[PDB]
Ligand binder design. Structure first.
Ligand SMILES: Nc1ncnc2c1ncn2[C@@H]1O[C@H](COP(=O)(O)OP(=O)(O)OP(=O)(O)O)[C@@H](O)[C@H]1O
Ligand SMILES: Nc1ncnc2c1ncn2[C@@H]1O[C@H](COP(=O)(O)OP(=O)(O)OP(=O)(O)O)[C@@H](O)[C@H]1O
Lengths: 319, 319
């Protein structure tokens, strides 16, 4: 069994993807070769891909897309590209046409779970509680049916890039412009204060197996990029310090969401606990595997070690 | 300015796609080259592609994916591949990574408008009226919470392929077995009897401009494959014989749906009219351009002639 790991990407999470690649390459129980997509869209192969991993960033690539790599010597392809052009169905689409079995969600599921507006629309219709929001397009005046504090985010982000905590209605125009630098569409959600952040991992093809619920606590305005990746800043509490009844309800809503969206392989479902009420934030089809990441730590506490978790992903790709 | 038209495909609409290629190549005001994807998934380039167009169908191709095509020679790519692996975001995904401007909806919108379940879920949440429906996964037993007649369809279909009008529950199993030949997911919708079919074309990126409403009349059990593609069977009444406020509601609902799903370039939005109530059937991101297709005819009634429609489409790809 030979696996091809693709990491990097043109998205703002390029550096996160490379850190995720370190975590996967060190624990994958199968012979694996790395391929890096540099920030300019061009690929780096072989030894140049491994050298880019040591630098934690790869700005320039060698090979223009489609890369002259031998796809036939790989049984499974593992796309570990977070964000736009990687987790949104584009690379999955290319892999579908190539006929190569791949890890993770398909085209539709990847495209849906990456669009914060559309994913919430599907979830709300399925009877899953979501935070009340409104979608704002670029060049269109902001019509918000609710009062501040807000949470302005680009519809396609990850790693809290372009996300702002808006307190006044005056600060909305400036936060939307920051959001519009990464996407043509943005969401304006209602901020929950105080809030406990619950995260659960899922494994399986459509009908999943849930991991124990975990909690994230911090000393920052919100769970931002700095808090997410700089060591020791975030408090990863596995298992989550709450009532065993609401711990079961988190797992049930996660598995229900997974099935509705038709997700394959994996996902880490983020939740919000605000005054007894549970709300679903988002689903991430290609979650992080960085040293401070939640997904592999959740399954480690569930009796499923790091080499076993990655082995199960490769097996789900083939089935 | 040179356009690459991609037609054919591995989907059951392969033949319909080649007919659409004949329609676009005859009216497009730019020098255009054709690339054909054969039924086996292999590509036909240059002269072999133009010969495939005269033969009604291309069972076998020459080049495996990715094709050794000179992409740099083209400014805009026009994917005219109806159905699975063409209209679902897969080909759009490849084109995105290629850095190639292309006609029509992006990955997300293409995947959503192709899935008869997910599109209706997103639309129903947005407040757009849709027919009562249920989704059924392969192997799983159906649960239909409404009375017969039904319309059973493969979730990723086009050109009425695999669609059955079910009268008794004794016939549900056979209809689902037919539907499961084309997809791993099927939809069972409540059949509207009697029903009037309204179609409206949309042109533009996200905020589109609607064409006048057209009504389809025919003498067959439903608007099936042979009624759709045999000359003279499907009559188009343009402008549709509707009430003053109803013609406006159809256009407004189409533009609302188009904006929500974030569709780019084009879409033909199909509706149903039963007992004074309007229902959105589906959006088609790559509608047909065959001699019996409704999309170009919907626009020529709105002052946008065939060469101008295609000019707008190629131009919108660069906007
Ligand atoms: N409606 C809200 N109420 C309270 N806090 C919020 C809300 N929305 C976002 N946040 C805060 O901002 C962060 C953004 O998380 P989100 O999952 O929305 O960003 P992401 O970049 O999509 O997350 P990931 O990095 O897991 O993809 C949350 O972790 C939370 O701390
Ligand atoms: N719920 C329904 N009630 C009544 N008739 C229906 C219903 N659903 C489908 N039909 C009939 O079946 C036809 C095809 O359904 P649909 O429009 O969903 O097929 P399609 O293959 O998706 O159409 P296209 O060829 O435009 O893609 C309709 O035009 C209509 O005549």
């Amino acid at each position: 069994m030979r696996v091809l790991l693709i990491a990097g990407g043109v998205s703002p999470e390029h550096e996160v993807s490379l850190l995720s690649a370190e975590g996967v390459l060190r624990h994958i129980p199968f012979p694996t070769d790395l391929a890096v997509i540099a920030q300019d869209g061009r690929w780096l192969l072989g030894e140049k891909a491994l050298t880019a991993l040591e630098a934690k960033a790869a700005p320039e690539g060698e090979h223009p897309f489609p890369p002259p790599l031998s796809w036939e010597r790989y049984d499974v392809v593992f796309p570990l590209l977070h964000g736009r052009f990687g987790e949104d169905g584009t690379v999955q689409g290319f892999l579908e046409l190539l006929g190569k079995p791949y890890v993770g969600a398909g085209v539709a599921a990847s495209a849906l779970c990456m669009d914060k507006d559309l994913s919430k629309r599907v979830l709300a219709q399925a009877g899953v509680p979501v935070v009340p929001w409104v979608a704002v397009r670029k060049g269109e005046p902001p019509v918000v049916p609710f009062d501040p504090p807000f949470f302005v985010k680009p519809a396609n982000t990850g790693s809290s890039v372009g996300i702002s905590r808006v307190e006044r209605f005056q600060d909305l125009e400036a936060a939307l412009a920051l959001a519009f630098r990464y996407d043509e569409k943005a969401v304006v959600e209602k901020a929950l204060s105080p809030v406990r952040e619950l995260e659960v991992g899922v494994l399986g093809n459509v009908f999943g197996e849930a991991s124990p619920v975990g909690e994230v606590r911090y000393e920052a305005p919100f769970y931002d990029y700095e808090t997410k990746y700089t060591p020791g800043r975030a408090e990863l509490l596995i298992p989550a310090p709450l009532d065993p009844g609401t711990q079961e309800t988190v797992q049930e809503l996660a598995l229900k969401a997974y099935k509705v969206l038709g997700v394959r392989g994996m996902a880490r479902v983020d939740f919000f606990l605000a005054e007894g009420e549970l709300y679903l934030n988002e689903l991430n089809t290609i979650p992080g595997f960085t040293p401070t990441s939640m997904y592999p730590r959740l399954f480690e506490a569930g009796g499923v070690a790091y080499p076993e978790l990655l082995r199960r992903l490769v097996e789900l790709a083939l089935t």
